[PDB]
Every structure is written in structure tokens, then in C-alpha cells.
């Protein structure tokens, strides 16, 4: 049986994130633009888009 | 021997159904299960820190 | 209806995209009912601007009171059902020298994100015949004998604070368009947006295909209108109407959109 | 009994005598213990799975 190690997502606030090429098996990275995540007290990010 | 949890702190996670339909940013929110046992026992990873005072 | 906020003129070039900026943190809701009836009251004690207030006791809607100081157990008492009748008063069983000062009872509505607070000044005397409750001009001042209980009254009978309704989804935002020459009230609706996500655009396909608001409109409270491929028929008086009917927010912003010029605009508002 | 609109109790009659009881003790079950959501007078709402 496998184990899917999923770390905390890197939310790049007010910037554009860049994928770093690692030699992990089935390594998967995807940068989604225009995300505006909400926490208990509102937006985690100061910038709007 | 259990003196390993010194500087720890629990969570408030994103429970998808907190009862009554909708979602809750809840402290009891379960994040991951694992059912590798061959006789139905379940190993659960919850966002609490039990036993600690 | 609503009230006015910003009544501006916006000049942009034909063929470009108009952006009628309309933002509000107090219109936020999400595609969840996640503590959308969550309020909090808390009692704090401070001693002026050059002293630090300390949280004594706080309370979520529909729950039982939690005390922060072990000494204060069985000493500071709130009504556990404060949110049914709006009687948020605090009883101190026995007072001491550390309790002199200004107490603030804080009401906070996390859903509308409104905050309101009231002050009461405590002075502890030694003679009981000098004990009185009076109005200093802006807050109640109670002089209480040492060791007696103190009822610091905090009563707010507004419907927004009690547990009676709080059916949330009646916030709605309206986008209106006033064409030149067309009188008011008969203005054509451009967009109706319900907090649940549903949208209503009106008019022939030429208008509906070109009118959009960003998909995270109600989530962040930004209902700015984006008008793609501006035509001469788009000119007019646009209005953003933010309505949060339960918490009493009723605002509209007016934008006089004229399409003439790309670069030589004057900064209004 | 005294015709208030409190949010704690309920009324139930016995031998034409109206007695009072607690909202927290009532429950509904299909097979699982259901969850009570809407509570108003002679009306109750529930949301709970397939029970026969
Ligand atoms: C508010 O609470 C205080 C605390 O004892 C009580 O004396 C008073 O009668 C209450 N008033 C109302 C209107 O409920």
C-alpha cells in the first residue's frame, strides 16, 4: 500500500509561484492563478487578484 | 515516553460537513484516515491534542 | 432602498474594458453556512489609554460563559442565555482593588462584521450610602461598596443581536443602468446577484453577452462591473447596490460612465 | 404555560393539564439519531439518512 504525502499548499501572496523540479516519484506540482483563499477572519492575502 | 508534545498546538480545520449539511471551520475536523489493518480496526488522525493538560 | 456613497465620473476609450470598481468587506458570504450566525460578546477592563485592557469573559451565541481567571470563577457571572433577550449584563459577585476602572461590553457580529462597544465606569467606595449609579454624559458610572456585587448593565434590544431570525441569504447586490434621457425607476436591470451565487441578467443578447462580474463577487464582497468591448450604447449612469437587509447595510454607488477619451481623465472622488 | 416565547422549553398535555418539558430531551430517529434543525411550535425539521 502507498501513502500519499501531501504537505501544506504554498500560497504565494501578491506574487507568482514557481515550481521547483525535484526527483521525487510521481512528483506533482501545479500553480493556480487568481486564488483568493478565505480563513476564519477573511482573506489570507492583502492583494485582490 | 509521551514527553514529546511539549510545544504543540491544535488546529481549526476545514470540516466539509459539520452536521446539518454545511461546512464548518471546526476543531474536531478530521484530516486523514488509514485502514491498513486486516481486521477492521481504524487508525484516525484528528485535529485535537488529547491527553495533554 | 439605499444611500449614496461615491458618485463619480469615469472616462475610458471605446473598445477597451470598463471596470466599475465596487468593493465591500461587509457583504462577504461564502458557499457555506459556516458559523453565519456567530456573534461574540466580551467584557474587558481597562484603565485609560496608558493601561492595557484585559479580557475577563467572552461568549459565543447559544453557549455557556467561559472565564479566563481562576480567581474569577464563581465571581464574574453572565446570563448564559444573553442572546435570547439582549440582556448582556455582568454580575461581579465580589469586587477588589484590581477591578476599578472602565469596563467595556463589546458586541460583535462576525457575519456582518460589525463591532459595537459600551463603557461603564466602576469606582469602589467604603460607605454604602454613597453607592449610586449615574450618567456622566456618555456612560453609566457605578460607585459600589467593596465586596458587594456589581451589576454592570449591557442591554441591546436591536434585532440583529438576538437569536430570533438571522436568515442570512437575503443580502443581494443589484447592478443598474440609467441610460441618458431615461427617467429613474424605469431603469433596466443589468445584473441581480444573490448570495447563493445565482445571477439574473436582463435585456437582449448584445447586452447579456458583454456584462459580467468576477466569479468571486460575493465571496470577497467585490462586485465591480466588467464591461467588455465598450460601445457607444453602453454610456450612462451605472449603479452598484449592495444590500445586506438583516444587518441594515443599504448602500449604492453611482458611476457616470462616458466613453470619449483614453488618457486625459481627471481623477474624481 | 404562561404564554411566553422562550427558547428553552415545550408543552405537552396530560389529562387536560398542560405540563412543560425540555427541547434538549426530544429526539427523532429513522435508524440513526437524527439532527433537529428547525423548531417552531407544532413543527419540526430533520435531516437524517435512509431509515425504513
Ligand atoms: C437583566 O439581567 C439582570 C441580571 O440579574 C436582571 O437583574 C435583570 O432583571 C435583567 N433584565 C431583563 C430585562 O431581562
UniProtKB/Swiss-Prot annotation, chain A:
Protein name: Spike glycoprotein E1
Species, as recorded: Chikungunya virus (strain 37997) (CHIKV)
Function: Class II viral fusion protein. Fusion activity is inactive as long as E1 is bound to E2 in mature virion. After virus attachment to target cell via host MXRA8 and endocytosis, acidification of the endosome induce dissociation of E1/E2 heterodimer and concomitant trimerization of the E1 subunits. This E1 trimer is fusion active, and promotes release of viral nucleocapsid in cytoplasm after endosome and viral membrane fusion. Efficient fusion requires the presence of cholesterol and sphingolipid in the target membrane.
PTM section of the record: N-glycosylated.
Domain of life: Viruses
Compartments where located: Virion membrane; Host cell membrane
Region (E1 fusion peptide loop): 35-49
Covalent S-S links between cysteines: 13-45, 14-47, 19-29
Quaternary data: Interacts with spike glycoprotein E2. The precursor of protein E3/E2 and E1 form a heterodimer shortly after synthesis. Processing of the precursor of protein E3/E2 into E2 and E3 results in a heterodimer of the spike glycoproteins E2 and E1. Spike at virion surface are constituted of three E2-E1 heterodimers. After target cell attachment and endocytosis, E1 change conformation to form homotrimers. Interacts with 6K protein. Interacts with host MXRA8; this interaction mediates virus entry. The interaction involves 2 adjacent E2-E1 heterodimers.
Membrane topology category: Single-pass type I membrane protein
Curated annotation (Swiss-Prot), chain C:
Domain Ig-like V-type: from-to ranges: 8-125, 128-260
This protein's UniProt keywords: Cell adhesion, Cell junction, Cell membrane, Cell projection, Cytoplasm, Disulfide bond, Glycoprotein, Immunoglobulin domain, Membrane, Nucleus, Phosphoprotein, Repeat, Signal, Tight junction, Transmembrane, Transmembrane helix
Chief location: membrane
Residue positions where Phosphoserine is found in the record: 196
GO cellular component annotations of the record: bicellular tight junction; cell surface; ciliary membrane; cytoplasm; nucleus
Effect of residue 99 to E: No significant effect on integrin ITGAV:ITGB3 binding
RGD 1, short sequence motif: residues: 97-99
Motif RGD 2, residue range(s) on this chain: 220-222
Superkingdom of origin: Eukaryota
UniProt keyword Glycoprotein present: yes
Extracellular topological intervals: 8-260
Residues bearing attached sugar chains per UniProt: 87
UniProt keyword Manganese present: no
Induction of expression: Disruption of the blood-brain barrier by cold injury results in a drastic reduction in expression. Up-regulated in primary chondrocytes in response to BMP2 and PTHLH/PTHrP.
Disulfide feature: 22-105, 154-240
Record note on domains: RGD motif 2 (but not RGD motif 1) is involved in integrin ITGAV:ITGB3 binding.
Record's function text: Transmembrane protein which can modulate activity of various signaling pathways, probably via binding to integrin ITGAV:ITGB3. Mediates heterophilic cell-cell interactions in vitro. Inhibits osteoclastogenesis downstream of TNFSF11/RANKL and CSF1, where it may function by attenuating signaling via integrin ITGB3 and MAP kinase p38. Plays a role in cartilage formation where it promotes proliferation and maturation of growth plate chondrocytes. Stimulates formation of primary cilia in chondrocytes.
Quaternary context: Homodimer in cis. Does not appear to form trans-homodimers. Interacts with ITGB3; the interaction inhibits ITGAV:ITGB3 heterodimer formation.
Protein name: Matrix remodeling-associated protein 8
Source organism of the structure: Mus musculus (Mouse)
Part of the whole protein covered: 39 to 291 of 442
Amino acid at each position: 500500500e502507498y501513502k500519499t504525502v501531501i504537505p501544506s499548499p504554498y500560497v504565494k501572496c501578491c506574487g507568482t509561484a514557481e515550481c521547483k523540479d525535484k526527483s521525487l516519484p510521481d512528483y506533482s506540482c501545479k500553480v493556480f492563478t487568481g486564488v483568493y483563499p478565505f480563513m476564519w477572519g477573511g482573506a489570507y492575502c492583502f492583494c485582490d487578484a | 515516553n509521551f514527553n514529546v508534545y511539549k510545544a504543540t498546538r491544535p488546529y481549526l480545520a476545514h470540516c466539509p460537513d459539520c452536521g446539518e449539511g454545511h461546512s464548518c471551520h471546526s476543531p474536531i475536523a478530521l484530516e486523514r484516515i488509514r485502514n491498513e489493518a486486516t481486521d477492521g480496526t481504524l487508525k484516525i488522525q484528528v485535529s485535537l491534542q488529547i491527553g495533554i493538560k | 432602498s439605499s444611500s449614496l456613497v461615491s458618485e463619480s465620473v469615469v472616462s475610458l476609450a471605446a473598445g477597451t474594458q470598463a471596470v466599475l470598481r465596487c468593493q465591500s468587506p461587509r457583504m462577504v458570504w461564502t458557499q457555506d453556512r459556516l458559523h453565519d450566525r456567530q456573534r461574540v460578546v466580551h467584557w474587558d477592563l481597562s484603565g485609560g489609554p496608558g493601561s492595557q485592557r484585559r479580557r475577563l469573559v467572552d461568549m459565543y451565541s447559544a453557549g455557556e460563559q467561559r472565564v479566563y481567571e481562576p480567581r474569577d470563577r464563581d465571581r464574574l457571572l453572565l446570563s448564559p442565555s444573553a442572546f435570547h433577550d439582549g440582556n448582556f449584563s455582568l454580575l461581579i459577585r465580589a469586587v477588589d482593588r484590581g477591578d476599578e476602572g472602565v469596563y467595556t461590553c463589546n458586541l460583535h457580529h462576525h457575519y456582518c462584521h460589525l463591532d459595537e462597544s459600551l463603557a461603564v465606569r466602576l469606582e469602589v467606595t467604603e460607605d454604602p450610602l454613597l453607592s449610586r449609579a449615574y450618567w456622566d454624559g456618555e456612560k453609566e458610572v457605578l460607585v459600589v461598596a467593596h465586596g458587594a456585587p456589581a451589576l454592570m448593565t449591557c442591554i441591546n434590544r436591536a434585532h440583529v443581536w438576538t437569536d430570533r431570525h438571522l436568515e442570512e441569504a437575503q443580502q443581494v447586490v443589484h447592478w443598474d443602468r440609467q441610460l441618458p434621457g431615461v427617467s429613474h425607476d424605469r431603469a433596466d436591470r443589468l445584473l441581480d446577484l444573490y448570495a447563493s451565487g445565482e445571477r439574473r441578467a436582463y435585456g437582449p443578447p448584445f447586452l447579456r453577452d458583454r456584462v459580467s462580474v468576477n466569479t468571486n463577487a460575493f465571496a470577497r464582497g467585490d462586485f465591480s462591473l466588467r464591461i467588455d468591448e465598450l460601445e457607444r450604447a453602453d454610456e450612462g449612469i451605472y449603479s452598484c447596490h449592495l444590500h445586506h437587509h438583516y444587518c441594515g447595510l443599504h448602500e449604492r454607488r453611482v458611476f457616470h460612465l462616458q466613453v470619449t477619451e483614453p488618457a486625459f481623465e481627471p481623477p474624481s472622488a | 404555560t404562561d404564554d411566553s416565547h422562550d427558547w428553552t422549553k415545550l408543552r405537552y398535555m396530560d389529562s387536560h393539564t398542560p405540563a412543560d418539558a425540555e427541547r434538549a430531551g426530544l429526539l427523532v430517529r429513522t435508524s440513526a439519531p437524527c439532527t433537529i434543525t428547525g423548531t417552531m411550535g407544532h413543527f419540526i425539521l430533520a435531516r437524517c439518512p435512509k431509515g425504513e
